[PDB]
């Protein structure tokens, strides 16, 4: 178990300011799992989440270790429709 941060941008059509949340993840965990945990915490279904780390869009079927996502790293997340 490890802790990582996900930070949003400003979304004007929603009324959301940028903010950072925390997740409890495992290096084994898939991007699908992490999106499921994000829905668990803020109610956003995965079909509306795009996560980005190190200017790479994270693909659903893959793991955090495949992108070398380590402790206290920060993913950014854009909300789509």
């Amino acid at each position: 178990g490890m802790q990582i941060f996900v930070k949003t941008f400003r979304d004007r059509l929603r009324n959301l300011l940028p903010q950072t949340i925390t997740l409890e993840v495992e290096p084994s965990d898939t991007i699908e799992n992490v999106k499921a945990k994000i829905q668990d915490k803020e109610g956003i279904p995965p079909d509306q989440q795009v996560l980005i780390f190190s200017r790479k869009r994270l693909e659903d079927g893959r793991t955090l270790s495949d992108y070398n996502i380590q402790k206290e790293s920060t993913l950014r997340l854009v909300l789509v429709f």
């Binding site: 004007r12 059509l13 929603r14 429709f81």
Partner: protein, 40 residues
Amino acid sequence: VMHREVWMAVFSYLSHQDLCVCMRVCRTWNRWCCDKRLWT
């Protein structure tokens, strides 16, 4: 139809008389236009 957050952005540029016309366009628009923040 379409997405709700898109249409409220455009609705926020409409006067009370302009907004008066849009709640007869469709059922979902009528529900969307009963938000008190549009008539601010």
